[PDB]
Design an enzyme around this catalytic site. Structure first.
Site, PDB file in Angstrom:
ATOM      1  CD  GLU B 357       5.311  26.159   0.931  1.00 54.15           C
ATOM      2  OE1 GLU B 357       4.085  26.232   1.147  1.00 54.15           O
ATOM      3  OE2 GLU B 357       6.140  26.877   1.526  1.00 54.15           O
ATOM      4  CG  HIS B 487       8.644  35.108  12.518  1.00 55.00           C
ATOM      5  ND1 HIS B 487       9.934  34.903  12.078  1.00 55.00           N
ATOM      6  CD2 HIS B 487       7.851  34.354  11.721  1.00 55.00           C
ATOM      7  CE1 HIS B 487       9.922  34.056  11.064  1.00 55.00           C
ATOM      8  NE2 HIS B 487       8.670  33.707  10.828  1.00 55.00           N
TER       9      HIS B 487
END
Ligand SMILES: *[C@@H]1O[C@H](CO)[C@@H](O)[C@H](O)[C@H]1NC(C)=O
Ligand SMILES: *[C@@H]1O[C@H](CO)[C@@H](O)[C@H](O)[C@H]1NC(C)=O
Ligand SMILES: *[C@@H]1O[C@H](CO)[C@@H](O)[C@H](O)[C@H]1NC(C)=O
Ligand SMILES: *[C@@H]1O[C@H](CO)[C@@H](O)[C@H](O)[C@H]1NC(C)=O
Ligand SMILES: *[C@@H]1O[C@H](CO)[C@@H](O)[C@H](O)[C@H]1NC(C)=O
Ligand SMILES: *[C@@H]1O[C@H](CO)[C@@H](O)[C@H](O)[C@H]1NC(C)=O
Lengths: 99, 596
Positions: B357, B487
């Protein structure tokens, strides 16, 4: 959000030095006449700044003061502070009193 | 005057009036994510509606400027991005139906609760409970029950919805001058107007097949080894000549094979490289984890985190009273505001996620100089790839020894490298045939090659042919087995993982060549190398201003995605798997020989 700061975003030509433009006339980017209304190809030149306290340092508001010093043929009156050495008496010294 | 100057002024006005609005929408989303309260949901919905309406009005203004009279590449790229209709070209009734279908699929997936018949007094949801059962159970019928019951309920609810969804998305895509929705997804990699560096929508499928043909021997050897180990674990279910049972792959859908590391370990007797206990003994806070990650990024020469990042991020779970989303997410809120929302625990996985991240944050910071509508990755693969390379570099034993988290007298022999490479293959290599098969099936569904009555008969046939996974029991057309994944049910592209996986090892080879590492690729660490950071930052600063082919030329020196770095990364493991598969039979049969 502090939107109390506007900038000019579009003008046909660059400003001259030390010029202030406070006109609020619609910028004409296209051949069509704007007719005073903000529609298509016609934008209002003054846009507000978005100032939030959580913004990055490149987007945080910065207060800028520019001091301009000019010399004209008139006698110069804005002088700096003239540092004064303590007075010494009864000795052969080099005195400089008011020039 | 001219069309180009009009477009330039319009783009300046657009970026100016879309930056503050994007900042407000992102701040509302952040306030929802760190504080789940109904007023925050209302503020998020209001900001999102304002953002979408403003984007619709700006796209409507943007379409009046024809594309062919503009020669500047960046201006043409922004105008191409803005002038997309999206769902606006479709009729209002069908657009509302599509939005309603997407929202109801989101609610069905998020609040889907399934439990055993005859014991309905309490039930388990997938994310709190079924994941742990799929990842840790060793019982055949329990995993079979969970898998079949969840696909029964979710597929029977979602099958008419998906049948409407494919037709509506195909109608929208053909209304937008595309062949199908698959062509719309493949248009992200489309480069037009650059001499030599042009990339076509049709070339992507050919390149994916060309890379997968070289993926196939390594995956066949890995599949044979995993098949042999699962045969050892489960004596009678797995056949020597057939495919693997679907519910035994360690996850709910087969997305990753990383939960089979315990069953398929080569050398269990040898120790692991787990550094969790060392951080527990030295009391490493999550703040120290992020500071060590920042030290890693300043070691390679990238810029360090802003003051606003340290002040405004939430790096610890707030408490019982305050609710927050547990998923780690890096937020580029706009106007130089970068934050990380992660409920960081003292684990190796959270440490690697923190590096990933912060790599996302570095990528977001790099293109801050770019115009607002170009502030993205060149494609969807690069954005994840720049985090995955940090995940690769941080996980190395050299990095752990350098930062003091590992003992300096730890013996790095070949067995630990083999089992670590096998774990990385189960995480990384194992997802590639599943990703390729799912995307190719979705492309054939959108293209109309497969009729609606034959979706599943082909699909399992594809899974046996490509993934080497057999269905436990045959499924009819009342099931909707693909849409159980997050997804696909929520309208997200899936080829990003395949492209990310190849770009990850391409970038890894490029940075290790820059850093002058002289050993194996998996033993390489990109710390302390200023030139590697400079080579990375040259691509990172571009953002979406340049084509992804030119960016790949800037980093690795190639004009196309390549499969050789992945094979070079796993080459010791490839030789070890070839040695271990002498007695066993490589390859599988598509017939129903194990069980059906
Ligand atoms: C989260 O929301 C609650 C209720 O609205 C509020 O009392 C609390 O201060 C909020 N927390 C933060 C960190 O803003
Ligand atoms: C294209 O536009 C950008 C800003 O809009 C400008 O900086 C750049 O110089 C332009 N390129 C050419 C070739 O004019
Ligand atoms: C968007 O839709 C309008 C109306 O259907 C059409 O004129 C325009 O060409 C479309 N834009 C693109 C990029 O397809
Ligand atoms: C980032 O680095 C600069 C220069 O090394 C330093 O002045 C600044 O304080 C650093 N920022 C943080 C948050 O440590
Ligand atoms: C590691 O090396 C030793 C000695 O060279 C050898 O006996 C052993 O089989 C090797 N193990 C692996 C997994 O390559
Ligand atoms: C890289 O730099 C850090 C910070 O000075 C240092 O602790 C580390 O030992 C260096 N790595 C190597 C391999 O020298």
């Amino acid at each position: 959000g502090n939107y109390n700061y506007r900038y000019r975003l579009f003008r046909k030509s660059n400003l001259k030095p030390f010029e202030r433009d406070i006109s609020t006339e619609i910028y004409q980017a296209g051949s069509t006449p704007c007719n005073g209304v903000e529609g298509f190809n016609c934008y209002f030149p003054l846009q507000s700044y978005g100032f939030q306290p959580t913004n990055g340092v490149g987007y945080q508001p910065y207060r800028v003061v520019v001091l301009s010093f000019e010399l004209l043929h008139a006698p110069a009156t804005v002088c700096g502070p003239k540092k004064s050495t303590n007075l010494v008496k009864n000795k052969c010294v080099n005195f400089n009193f008011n020039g | 005057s001219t069309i180009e100057e009009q477009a330039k002024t319009f783009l300046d006005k657009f970026n100016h009036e879309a930056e503050d609005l994007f900042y407000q929408s992102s701040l509302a989303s952040w306030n929802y994510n760190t504080n789940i309260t109904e007023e925050n949901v209302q503020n998020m919905n209001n900001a999102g509606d304002k953002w979408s309406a403003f984007l619709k009005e700006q796209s409507t203004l943007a379409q009046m400027y024809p594309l062919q009279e503009i020669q500047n590449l960046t201006v043409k790229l922004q105008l191409q991005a803005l002038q997309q209709n999206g769902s606006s070209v479709l009729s209002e009734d069908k657009s509302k139906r599509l939005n309603t279908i997407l929202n109801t699929m989101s609610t069905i997936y998020s609040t889907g609760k399934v439990c055993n018949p005859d014991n309905p007094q309490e039930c388990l949801l997938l994310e709190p409970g079924l994941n742990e059962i799929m990842a840790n159970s060793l019982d055949y019928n329990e995993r079979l029950w969970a898998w079949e019951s969840w696909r029964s309920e979710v597929g029977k609810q979602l099958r008419p919805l998906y049948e409407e969804y494919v037709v509506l998305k195909n109608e929208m895509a053909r209304a937008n001058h595309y062949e199908d929705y698959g062509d719309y997804w493949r248009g992200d990699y489309e480069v037009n107007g650059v001499d030599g560096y042009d990339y076509s929508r049709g070339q992507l499928i050919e390149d994916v097949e060309h890379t997968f043909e070289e993926i196939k021997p390594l995956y066949e050897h890995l599949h044979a080894y995993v098949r042999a180990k699962l045969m050892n674990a489960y004596p009678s279910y797995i056949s020597p000549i057939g495919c693997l049972p679907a519910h035994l792959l360690g996850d709910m859908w087969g997305r990753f094979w990383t939960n089979l590391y315990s069953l398929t370990v080569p050398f269990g007797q040898k120790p692991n490289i787990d550094v969790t206990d060392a951080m527990v003994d030295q009391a490493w806070d999550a703040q120290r984890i992020f500071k060590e990650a920042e030290k890693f990024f300043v070691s390679v020469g990238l810029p360090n985190m802003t003051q606003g990042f340290w002040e405004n991020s939430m790096l610890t779970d707030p408490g019982n009273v305050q609710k927050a989303v547990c998923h780690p997410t890096a937020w580029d809120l706009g106007k130089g505001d970068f934050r990380i929302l992660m409920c960081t625990k003292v684990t190796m996985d959270d440490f690697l996620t923190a590096h990933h991240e912060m790599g996302h944050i570095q990528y977001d910071m790099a293109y801050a100089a770019q115009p607002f509508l170009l502030r993205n990755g060149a494609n969807e693969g690069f954005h994840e790839a720049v985090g995955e390379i940090m995940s690769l570099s941080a996980a190395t034993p050299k990095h752990l020894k350098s930062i003091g988290l590992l003992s300096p007298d730890f013996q790095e022999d070949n067995e630990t490298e083999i089992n670590f490479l096998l774990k990385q293959a189960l995480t990384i290599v194992g997802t590639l045939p599943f990703t390729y098969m799912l995307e190719k099936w979705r492309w054939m569904v959108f293209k109309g090659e497969i009729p609606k009555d034959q979706w599943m008969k082909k699909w399992w046939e594809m899974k046996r042919e490509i993934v080497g996974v057999v269905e436990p029991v045959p499924h009819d057309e009342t099931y909707c087995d693909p849409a159980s994944l997050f997804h696909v049910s929520n309208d997200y592209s899936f080829i990003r993982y395949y492209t990310r996986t190849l770009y990850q090892f391409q970038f890894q080879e490029a940075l290790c060549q820059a850093a002058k590492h002289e050993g194996p690729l998996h033993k390489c660490d990109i710390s302390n190398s200023t030139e590697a950071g400079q080579k990375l930052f040259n691509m990172l600063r571009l953002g979406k201003s340049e084509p992804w082919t030119l960016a790949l030329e800037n980093v690795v020196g190639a004009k196309n995605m390549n499969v050789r770095p992945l094979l070079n990364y796993f080459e010791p493991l490839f030789t070890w798997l070839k040695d271990q598969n002498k007695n066993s039979f490589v390859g599988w049969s598509t017939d129903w020989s194990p069980y059906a």
